[PDB]
Write a protein that binds this ligand. Structure first.
Ligand SMILES: CCN1CCC[C@@H](Nc2ccc(-c3c(C)cc(C(F)(F)F)cc3O)nn2)C1
Ligand SMILES: Nc1ncnc2c1ncn2[C@@H]1O[C@H](COP(=O)(O)OP(=O)(O)O)[C@@H](O)[C@H]1O
Length: 488
């Protein structure tokens, strides 16, 4: 009762996104499978029982965390679910252990400011609680669909997997609301737990909200208009900027280009090109501690560690001066509430350095065993690890950052990637790992026509489902380089 005031105060301070949230938060396009945030839990014209599970699916960098944090902030300010929820608990999935034994009470108390919250008072009205799980796909380790028995006592300590499974399956606090944000990759794993869910999709920035971000990022009208005009000209950057992460990456590297006397230009055509242009802007140590960065990222992906302690990065070679320089470069970030944890700015950046670990000029560097774990939850699906390998393998594409890569092993990896496409396109009997459209994103990163044309011949018939202008751009490129041997 009185604790709700103390709790909303704590939430309002923690969720001010000072890495302001209201200052740079740009409206995200959400569509049901357009939706008004307050009406998310309201039953449609047809049914009368309110919706308890709502799932937000979004691509990497689309803003699932920014949306979840903006919801925490809005609610704590009395502008969202004021009459609906007494408590909103923020479960940040990357910090959650699926093996450590904890009860639902222990988990709820973790979200509180004080060491002794009134837990029995809080769980008195379970329907007045909204558990908000940000990043389901970021649960480190294997998520088993066969685990049990399910739990019905909020005080019984259970293993993390049994605890979240019982919470998601609506066994623990059955009338409590749930908001799960996930990448569509994990939707396979999640759909089996879900109990009557409302599915919502985060489509990112509109063309209008793209311009808005550029004018919010740059506090000088001349600079904001120059950066937006650059994107309006580049078909790839204009198309890619629907992802708010691409908006930030592009704006940040364009800001560094404005500090120097360089005329605004970005001739990037692939996601690899964008990431290498961004990382090249930071090369003003990044080039000395490259092997350490890539070994940290490969270990974090293969042994499932999103958050690294000071001891972990010290083991990989990154000393106090190196972590303090990478943090300033906006490559690393301080995370896990006020605890001394570190992580790459985005999961895509960890996958970019994991992909680079396999190509570095001299974890297991065998690309065969990496491809064997592709599309599996227990390793993070390896989507950008494989995509960035296609891009970085490109020999008719170099930079100072790419010159430190072994062209001896990138030619062996290039041939192992081509055998992979051949296996995946031919045997279409598999139940999702690289879809045909996903293989097109991989070939788009490759960009070299000898490879793209050789690989496109392995596809017997083009069977794709386009949804975005990105899907059109990528698939259009692949089909252009898909000409029969006898053709014409
Ligand atoms: C499930 C795997 N796959 C199946 C085929 C369709 C594909 N759809 C997308 C959409 C956007 C992005 C994406 C990109 C192109 C760049 C960035 C980055 F710039 F931020 F890196 C982030 C992204 O999420 N990827 N795939 C997903
Ligand atoms: N609505 C938004 N407004 C402004 N910036 C955003 C927004 N959504 C995402 N971002 C940018 O994208 C970056 C990563 O987004 P995030 O929410 O972590 O993505 P996801 O959780 O889907 O992987 C943030 O650091 C931020 O700069």
């Amino acid at each position: 009762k009185d604790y709700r005031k103390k709790y909303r105060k704590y939430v309002r301070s923690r969720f001010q996104c000072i890495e302001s949230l209201n200052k740079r938060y740009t409206r995200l396009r959400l569509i049901k499978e357009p939706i008004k945030m307050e009406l998310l839990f309201d039953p449609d014209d047809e049914h009368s029982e309110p919706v308890h599970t709502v799932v937000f699916q979004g691509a990497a960098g689309i803003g699932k965390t920014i949306l979840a944090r903006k919801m925490m902030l809005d609610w704590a300010s009395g502008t969202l679910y004021q009459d609906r929820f007494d408590y909103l608990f923020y479960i940040h999935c990357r910090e959650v252990s699926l093996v450590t034994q904890r009860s639902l009470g222990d988990l709820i108390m973790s979200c509180c400011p004080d060491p002794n919250p009134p837990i029995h008072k809080i769980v008195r009205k379970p329907s007045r609680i909204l558990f908000l799980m940000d990043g389901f796909d970021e649960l480190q380790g294997a998520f088993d669909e066969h685990i049990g028995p399910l739990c019905t006592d909020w005080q019984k300590a259970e293993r993390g997997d049994i605890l979240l499974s019982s919470l998601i399956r609506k066994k623990l606090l059955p009338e409590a609301s749930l908001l799960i944000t996930t990448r569509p990759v994990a939707l396979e794993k999640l759909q089996h737990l879900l109990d009557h869910p409302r599915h919502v999709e985060i489509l990112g920035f509109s063309e209008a909200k793209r311009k808005e971000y550029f004018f919010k990022y740059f506090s000088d009208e001349a600079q904001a208009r120059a950066a937006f005009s650059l994107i309006q000209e580049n078909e790839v950057l204009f198309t890619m900027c629907f992802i708010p992460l691409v908006c930030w990456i592009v704006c940040t590297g364009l800001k560094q280009q404005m500090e120097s006397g360089k005329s605004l230009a970005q001739t990037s055509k692939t996601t690899t090109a964008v990431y290498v242009f961004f990382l090249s802007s930071l090369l003003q140590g990044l080039c000395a501690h490259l092997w350490g960065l890539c070994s940290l990222a490969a270990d974090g992906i293969w042994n499932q560690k999103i958050l690294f302690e000071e001891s972990d990065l010290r083991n990989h070679g990154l000393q106090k001066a190196d972590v303090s320089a990478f943090l300033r470069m906006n490559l690393f970030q301080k995370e896990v509430d006020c605890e001394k944890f570190y992580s790459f700015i985005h999961m895509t950046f960890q996958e970019f350095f994991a992909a680079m670990y396999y190509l570095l000029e001299e974890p297991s560097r065998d690309v065969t065993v990496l491809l064997e774990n592709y599309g599996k939850f227990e390793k993070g699906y390896l989507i950008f690890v494989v995509r960035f390998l296609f891009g970085l393998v490109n020999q008719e594409r170099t930079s100072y950052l790419e010159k430190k890569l072994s062209c001896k092993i990138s030619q062996q990896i290039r041939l192992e990637l081509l055998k992979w496409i051949e296996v995946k396109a031919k045997a279409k009997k598999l139940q999702i790992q690289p879809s045909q459209l996903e293989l097109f994103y991989c070939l788009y990163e490759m960009q070299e026509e000898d490879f793209v044309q050789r690989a496109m011949d392995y596809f017997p018939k083009i069977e794709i489902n386009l949804s975005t202008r990105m899907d059109h751009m990528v698939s259009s490129f692949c089909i252009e380089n898909c000409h029969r041997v006898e053709s014409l």
